[PDB]
Amino acid sequence: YNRLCIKPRDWIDECDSNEGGERAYFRNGKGGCDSFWICPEDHTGADYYSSYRDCFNACI
């Protein structure tokens, strides 16, 4: 399965709507994509899997 939809620990994980709301969906383990709120500056010009259908097809 796809390597970027797992997500590391030391990267800025939870900015939220008013600070910088990039909603990026990433796998916990068995079957479930969780939306982490990044911040604009860390993720480059890409958008890291912004739906439950894109992350669940790519990782699960």
Side-chain angles (χ1 to χ4, degrees):
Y1 64 79
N2 290 27
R3 290 186 287 179
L4 194 277
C5 59
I6 306 93
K7 167 234 83 292
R9 177 57 278 190
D10 59 295
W11 82 300
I12 310 161
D13 77 278
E14 61 196 80
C15 296
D16 303 309
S17 63
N18 295 90
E19 193 177 273
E22 171 67 289
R23 293 186 75 249
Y25 280 78
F26 299 116
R27 61 126 276 211
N28 61 75
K30 75 292 178 183
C33 281
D34 292 90
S35 73
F36 285 85
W37 300 78
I38 315 180
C39 280
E41 52 67 64
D42 190 277
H43 73 82
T44 198
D47 190 74
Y48 292 176
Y49 299 93
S50 67
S51 77
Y52 198 96
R53 193 75 274 157
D54 296 296
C55 169
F56 203 97
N57 293 5
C59 267
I60 311 302

